[PDB]
Design an enzyme around this catalytic site. Sequence first.
Site, PDB file in Angstrom:
ATOM      1  CD  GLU A 123      -3.181  -0.697   0.056  1.00 20.89           C
ATOM      2  OE1 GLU A 123      -3.071   0.349  -0.591  1.00 20.89           O
ATOM      3  OE2 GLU A 123      -4.110  -1.508  -0.150  1.00 20.89           O
TER       4      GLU A 123
ATOM      5  CG  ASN B  41      -8.493   6.277  -4.379  1.00 18.39           C
ATOM      6  OD1 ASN B  41      -8.756   6.608  -3.216  1.00 18.39           O
ATOM      7  ND2 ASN B  41      -7.518   5.451  -4.672  1.00 18.39           N
TER       8      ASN B  41
ATOM      9  CG  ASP C 289     -13.789   7.409  -5.650  1.00 17.21           C
ATOM     10  OD1 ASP C 289     -12.694   7.973  -5.364  1.00 17.21           O
ATOM     11  OD2 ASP C 289     -14.429   6.706  -4.837  1.00 17.21           O
TER      12      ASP C 289
ATOM     13  CB  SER D 201     -11.892   9.212  -2.478  1.00 17.70           C
ATOM     14  OG  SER D 201     -11.478   8.026  -3.113  1.00 17.70           O
TER      15      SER D 201
ATOM     16  CG  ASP E  14      -6.575   5.121  -1.142  1.00 17.79           C
ATOM     17  OD1 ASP E  14      -7.755   5.310  -0.707  1.00 17.79           O
ATOM     18  OD2 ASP E  14      -6.278   4.253  -1.971  1.00 17.79           O
TER      19      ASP E  14
ATOM     20  CG  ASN F  25     -11.105   6.105  -0.170  1.00 19.86           C
ATOM     21  OD1 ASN F  25     -12.280   6.513  -0.177  1.00 19.86           O
ATOM     22  ND2 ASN F  25     -10.292   6.235  -1.207  1.00 19.86           N
TER      23      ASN F  25
HETATM   24 NA    NA Z   1      -9.511  13.536  -2.313  1.00 21.47          NA
END
Ligand code: NA
Length: 129
Positions: free
Chosen positions: A35, A46, A48, A50, A52, A59
């Site tokens: 990760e 990400n 979408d 968002s 991480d 997230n």
């Molecule tokens: Na963001």
Amino acid sequence: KVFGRCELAAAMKRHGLDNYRGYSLGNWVCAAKFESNFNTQATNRNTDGSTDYGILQINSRWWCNDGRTPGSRNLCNIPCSALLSSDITASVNCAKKIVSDGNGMNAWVAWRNRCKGTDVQAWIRGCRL
Ligand code: NA
Ligand SMILES: [Cl-]
Ligand SMILES: [Cl-]
Ligand code: NA
């Protein structure tokens, strides 16, 4: 902070992540490796919208607030930047909530694709814990 492998294993164990929800310590170390490369400062956007954050790439759509994510729930009730600290407490607390959510560690894509089903004990081999 970029943790060493055994250094992160010891911190995770002290924080009670070892065997948490039945996931042995090697699972958590393996997940952190893929990760974040053990880097507390890691961030990744990400598709979408968002992002991480941190050692376990938590997230901003569900878990932490980053102030720019549509539909944010902030279930860990923390600013996402707190997950970038050299002190892993906030990331561990939030990871305990995530892994309790019903899908276990399958919540972490890198864990499912790179750790699940492998010899995860290898990740803590050599360490004094
Ligand atoms: Na963001
Ligand atoms: Cl293990
Ligand atoms: Cl499970
Ligand atoms: Na970053």
